[PDB]
Each structure stands twice: as structure tokens, then as C-alpha cells.
Design a protein around this ligand. Sequence first.
Ligand code: ZN
Lengths: 141, 140, 69, 101, 203, 119, 53
Amino acid sequence: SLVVPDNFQHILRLLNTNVDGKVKVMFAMTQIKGVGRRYANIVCKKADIDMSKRAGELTTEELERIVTIIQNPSQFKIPSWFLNRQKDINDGKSFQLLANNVDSKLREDLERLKKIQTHRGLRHALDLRVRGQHTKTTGRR
Amino acid sequence: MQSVQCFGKKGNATAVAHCKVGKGLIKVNGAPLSLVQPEILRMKVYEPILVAGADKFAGVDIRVRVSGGGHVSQIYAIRQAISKAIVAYYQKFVDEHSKAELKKALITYDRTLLVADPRRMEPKKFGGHGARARQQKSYR
Amino acid sequence: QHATVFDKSIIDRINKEVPAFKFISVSVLVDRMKINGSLARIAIRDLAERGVIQKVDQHSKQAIYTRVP
Amino acid sequence: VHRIRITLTSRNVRNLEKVCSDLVNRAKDKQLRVKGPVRLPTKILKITTRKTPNGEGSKTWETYEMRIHKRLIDLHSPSEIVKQITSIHIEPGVEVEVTIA
Amino acid sequence: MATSSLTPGVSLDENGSIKLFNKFPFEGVEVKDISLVDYITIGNGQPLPHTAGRFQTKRFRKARCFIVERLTNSLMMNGRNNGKKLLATRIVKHAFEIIALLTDQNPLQVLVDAVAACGPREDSTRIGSAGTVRRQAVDVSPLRRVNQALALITIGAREAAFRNVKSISECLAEEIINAAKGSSNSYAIKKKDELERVAKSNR
Amino acid sequence: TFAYRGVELEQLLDLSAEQLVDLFHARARRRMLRGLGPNASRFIRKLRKAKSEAPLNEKPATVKTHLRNMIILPEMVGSVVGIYNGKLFNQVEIRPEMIGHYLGEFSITYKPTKHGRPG
Amino acid sequence: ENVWFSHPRKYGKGSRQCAHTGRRLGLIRKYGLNISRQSFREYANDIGFVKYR
RNA sequence: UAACAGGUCUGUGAUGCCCUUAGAUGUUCUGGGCCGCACGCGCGCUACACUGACGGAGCCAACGAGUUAUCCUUGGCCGGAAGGUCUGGGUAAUCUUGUUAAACUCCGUCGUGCUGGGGAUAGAGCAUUGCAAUUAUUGCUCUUCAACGAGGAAUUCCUAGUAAGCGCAAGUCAUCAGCUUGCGUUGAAUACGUCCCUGCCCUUUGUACACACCGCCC
Ligand SMILES: [Zn+2]
């Protein structure tokens, strides 16, 4: 139903991460940190690329347009209610979470909660659960 | 006139029919006997039709309504309802010997089509979720 | 592992290997060749409109096909 | 024009039947379209509780039952006969109510 | 002849052909292996394996149950699927039609030969009561032979298809065809041989 | 110049109440949406007394109360309050950095962890 | 006429109880009974809760 | 029928006795709590995958509850079904309600790899219930999305609509089911045997036991 002798260029570096070459695009995009399942589906649908083809047959123009749409989701008529981060603490806007930035956002949030010295902060320092859970029988080892 | 009525149950399922004189037009709740909710549960409904053939059914018009029970309960109810409706029609409007041979033929090849099925679930007793199943004792 | 590179060989192979067997489905083609699942049903669908395979009874999980005779 | 509907709710089967028989007999003594008794589904309330005042002991649960029975009667009687039959139908344990409009 | 309802001629032709199975003949199949007659209802033709009836009320009421139904009942294993008869019926139907596609003979005949060959002849019960806790060679009844064959076939199919691409129906069909004949590639036959050899060893 | 949403601390000190209640977490903003110091208005006024009495120090003269279930607000921030954790009026030293969270989220009431392990 | 003595309530505990009970544990409000389980057991027959089954 | 030295003096204006009563072992308002953990033991739950997951679509039950100020909910409309809007049905087999359920089935994908099976665990906002939800009630939009890859020795329940699996109703409730009590659907194999392991009754017999073998005694 599709052209068999197509182009393949294995994997490529993307957002300081590796996107699988011979793998379905839905599976491959989950390798990028900060990407789920519905998020991957909607961004690809808004990027308007053929779903049957995998990530190994994509071209430079399609790859660049897809990532730019991901870099600027809200500008491309992507609804803001879906966005993971809305009304950021520092930015003050509904900034989109990525892979390279979340590699340091977790520790940035940790220092945010530790410098101000909350009860949640000492729970994080002592490696205990922060929600009102129970550890009398569970939460062991 | 020539018409009878009957019903059929398999526990918490009921199916009441209304026989009439006609030239076919056999259906099960709007849809015909061919089209039903399941697909692997079709021959169960077809069980009493094939035994006597369709020539005897060419002179009867029956539409049966089904209400209550699960999928297997409903298909058993409708096949029981149509079978008892047919034998009621042939008991009241054709020779007794013909009814005797039809009922005997149905009895010989009977998946509880005519005889009622007294199947019920025993009440749940305290001490466990099931009537007989009980929570395990730590014995120590 | 199962290969998925469309190197022009799989399409010709399956088109010349369908007459080898009668029952064609995902379970048997996995044994026949290293097929990753997508082409498993895509190729069957693309060969359905051809007279090589005759349908018998289709289901959501699998469909039954037979040869020309 | 003036239809009288009276309630026959109670729990004692014998006394509600006696009240129902009395009004039906009067409705047959004087022809008022001779509308007979009407029976409603039983409203049974099921409650399950424990038996042990404390927590020690085996898991035993006691289930109690509370059922009530309702009947309705429609009559074409005039006001004077309606007030008369209600006067003679004073029985213990029977609750009656008449709706006019 | 037809009525307003479609009434496909397949059902009429099936009735004309003394009500054969779903897609296989019923007249012409019998148990050929000796010592297992009067306990398998091959002649009892039923359009569907399922039959919601009483199969345990009597001591030997189980002997009159349909062999296909008993196998679907055995396939009801794995309490994840305890109670899903529709899945078992579809698997059995798919296995039976695959067997017919593979070999031209009646899949019911394949099934009867398979259970007959798998059924153990000599077992070894335990004497118990402490002491030497040895075992003695004992023969078994035909009804228990069918029970062992059904259980061994089902457990072998589950073990074979527990983690693999092949479908449960395909694995069940492969087990049935491999057990109907002597190829030494059947897990049920292997357990049959193992039970026989340990029984002769402790005899 | 940045406490919760990047708006400057001086601006928060006299910002619009609706804007302040709108720049918070849904939980932390529904808290002030439905409850604004129930009987704690006296506590707010008493803190205003402390600010007027001792503005020279970052923490004015200590003032006690018996309630912490409300988040901190810019017009009341910058003081020390005595809160009964059960046997002691803990000094709390409210700071404007964490505007939008209760006082118990930052103080200690029960023995948290570590099994104690005395000697 | 007393301030900070008895706090008025409209929901939760401190709003409903029985005439001679109100332990709030092991108490049913079903059908507006508002009585303890032990009292219900003692006077079940008088109300009409008869162990038919 | 009798036996437990069984539980409940924290259901009980049911109570005998000991103690206290003003700096009250009396009433009451606020904060911390019964839920606080380097562990051992329980009763139940989740997946360990294709028998599943996702996505559309045809649809098949029962028992039960509800406002006198203040509960069960329909209809047009707005929405991020999390809410709120206004006329409104219901003191009741007349309104929720015919509690169009789940399981199932027609079709497409995930192809067998701790992955799109499994959501332990961490973060940001969206609403109702409640002087008000920190020690996140509850669900919601998401992201990070791990152990586990049918579990040893031991041990528990089960004889036909039985186990098993699934869902629903009610209890406690201002809110919150992973518990309990009932209902219905899908629906099996195994025995019609025994005292062999583990106990209960009867008869005979023996006894230096009689708080009675967890006994007496050298
Ligand atoms: Zn009480």
C-alpha cells in the first residue's frame, strides 16, 4: 500500500535524547522525557504527518516542523488545558515541559521546596512520602 | 380465530410470546431470528426450529419479546418461549397425534427447551462474601 | 527480534511465498518470517483485493484465508 | 365529579382486610360503581445489624424485616355517606386518608 | 421455501444433513481405540459445545457430558478466565477448524483419538500411613482416563502458549493433532509415559 | 521581587485582592475564596498592631494566636507568631517567599521520623 | 446569651443524636431512626422489626 | 441441658464496692490526634500480558433509598462533567427509575521485549462537600510513569448455578470504600468414599488423675 524502497537513516539526536530509528513513532516519542501517550498522539496529529510510516522514513523538514511545534505548542492552536504545566511559578505562564529542562527541573523544584524549609521539604530530605499515606505496614525497605 | 400465548424463563429472565396465524414474519424483538445480539449463541436459538423444519412454521406468525436476565438467559428464554408457543399452537389447532409426535420429537432432542429449568442461586450467608466461601482463619 | 527495514525484499518474498501455505494469519507468519506485526496485517489487506487469497471468516483478532483451489 | 380516594395502609393483614371488607360491603350495599379493592406492592425494609454489644466474638449479623402493605379504594359516595363510613370504620392500627382534589 | 425473515439455507441444509456439527460431519465418527467406549458421547450431536445443564448431580452423570463441552470445561482453567465460556468456545471452534484445515479427517475423530492415546492405563497410588511410604501399581477407570487426558492436554496447551506469539487455539490444535498420533512431541503423552514408567518401577 | 508568580514583593504588598486570589494554586486560592480569616480578623488586626509598634526590626514584637489553617498573605507577612503545636508556642518567622501556604506546612507539630533512637 | 461557650453547628457531629444515646458510633440514621444498635436490638419487636426469616 | 472463672462496669439515669469533688478524675472554647516509623504478624486489593490494553459501535438484570423546614434528581443553556445557572418532578410500585450497568460481541492498533501489561512513587492547576482539606477530603487535565515477568516451606475455603471472576444496592457520612451485609450476570474439574493425618459422639476396658495428663509423683 506504500512505497517499499524508501529512505532510512537509523536514529538521530533530538533534544539531547535519542529517537528510535526502526520503531513506531508513538513508541519512539515516549523515549523523549516529558512525553506521554495522548500528548504524543495530539502533537503528531497537529503536525500532520502520516501515521502508518514509522520514524525511520521521516525527512528533515518534517522532523524540524514537528519539533518546532512541540517547542511552541500553545502558538499552534494546541489547547492550554492539556498542558502539563500551567501558570508556572517562575515563568508565570503555561510553559511546556521538555526532556533536557526536566533533567534539572526536578532538582530545581527540590531546592525550591528545601530552601524555604517546609514540612514537605524535610520529608523530601528524609526520603519519606509527602502525601498523608501510611507506612506502619507498607512503605518498607 | 387461531392464536395462543405462552412464556419462557431461565431464572431472572422472562420472554412472553403471542402466537398468531400467518405466513412467516418470525422475528425476535424487531430483529429476525437470524440477527441477534450474540454471534456464537445463534444455534441455541435455532435448536427447536431445525428439528421440525420450517414447513410447519410456514403457517404461523410469532413475535416474541425478551426482558430480563443475561445473554445466555435471554437466548434460553426466547427459544423456550417460541418452542412452547409452537406446541401450544399445535396442541390447540391440529391433531393430538401430531402434537404427540412433535412433543416427543422435541423431548428426544431437548436442550431443556420445553421442561422448565429450576436453577437458582442460594442466598448469601454471613461470615463471608460467598454463600459457602469464607475468609481464611489465621489459626494462630 | 524482528526486522522492519523495507529493503524491497520482504514485499517480493511474501508475494511469491503466499502459495506455499493456505492458512495465513499473524500467528503463522511470525514463524514464517521475522515480521513485527504492522506488515503482518498490512500485507494481507493489500493482498485481499487480489485473487490469490480467498476469505472464509473474518474476525477482529484474525481472519481466515485459503488458496486459489 | 366528586371521586373519593381512601388509603388502606397498614401492617396487620387481618385488620386491614377487615377494614377493606367493611368498606367494600358498604360500597355494595349502596351502588357507587362497585369499585373493588386494589392491592399495591409490599414495601419491605431490610436492615442488617450485629448481635454482640462488644467486638469480641464471631462474625454474626442479624437481619430484621419491616414490611408494610398498601391498598387504594375509589368511591363515588356523597359527602354524608363518606363521613358516615369513615365514622364507622374506626379501627386500631389502620391509617386512612381521603384525597378530594 | 423461505419466509419474510432471511432464514439462510445453511441451517436448512444442516438439518437435512442429520444436524452435523458447526462445520464438521457427525455421522461417521466413532471411538476406534478400544477400552474407552460407553463413556464418550460421540453420537450425541449438539450444534454448540455449551450446554447449561446438570453435570454433577449424579455419581456418574459426568459420563454423559459432551466430550467437547468437557474439554471447554477443562480449558476454563486459570481463574483469571474462570467463568469466561465464550472465550473458550471461540478458542475451541478456532482450534477445530484449524485441525480440519490441516488434515482432512474429522477433528472430532482427531480429538477422540488424542484423548484415548493420552489416557493413562497404569497409575501408582500412595500407601501412606508412614512407614516405607512406597507406592503400588494400580490401574484406572475409563472415566478417570478421560479426566487425566483432558487435564494433561489443557495444562500442556497453557504451558506451551503461556508466553509465545502462537495463539491459544493454534497451540490447542497442535497438541490435539500431536496427541492423536504417535510422534513423541506431546507433553500429555510424555506425562502418560512418565506415569506408566514410575508405576512399573514401584510395582 | 519573586514570591509565587514572579510579581514583585512590593507589588504584592498592595496588589489587588482578586488578582492575588487568582494567581494561586486552585486549593490555595479556593482557601481564600471561601474563607478569609473566620474570627481571625482580630488576629490580622493584632498583627497590624505589632507592625505599627515595632517596625524597626524585621520581626516585630512577638504576638500569639491559636490558629494557622490559613495561608500567609503579603499585608500580614513579616512577623513572628506564637502557635501552639500542643505544648509550645513555636516562633514561626513568617517570610514572604512562600506566600500561599499554611503555617503548619512549614512548622513541626508531631515527631516526624528517625524512630527517635535515644541513648 | 453565652459567648464562646457553645459553638452553633449545622453539619457533622454535634448536630444529631438520640433521646437517651448519642455515642455517634454504632448508630444508624436509616429511616430517621437515630437510635443506637443496642437500643434497636432491645426494642426491635415493639417497632415492628420481627425476624421473619 | 450444663460448661468458659470468655467479652462488654468506654452502648445502657443497669448498678454494688474503692477513690476524687473546687487547684474537681465536673461542664466547656482553641492547637496538636487516635493516620506519627530503620520492623515482625494478619484480613483484602493490583498487574505479572494478546485470555490483555487502547479505541470506536449493538445491547442484556435484581435487591434496595429519598425533601417539614431543606433530601433523590429531570429540562434548555453555558464548561476544564470538576462545578454552578433558572424555572422544576417527587411525602413516593405516580419523580430519580425502565437506576438502557458490567461482563459480552463487530472492527482497527499495540506484537511480543520488566513496552501502549502493571500506575508503587514525585510535581503543577480545576471544582463541590465541610469556622476550613497542611499531615495533598474526593475526583479531575497532564508529566515522571518503577517493583512484579504466576511466587519456596507452610496454610485457608469449597460439592451445583458450588467455587472462581465481574458489577450493582445499602450500612457507617458534612465528604471519603480498598470493609461489611445482600443481589444479579458468566460459570467449571473434582467424591458420593474413609477414619489413614485432624477432630466430635457412643460402648467396653485400665488408672496411683479429680483445678481432672499443661495431672499426680521419684
Ligand atoms: Zn448506644
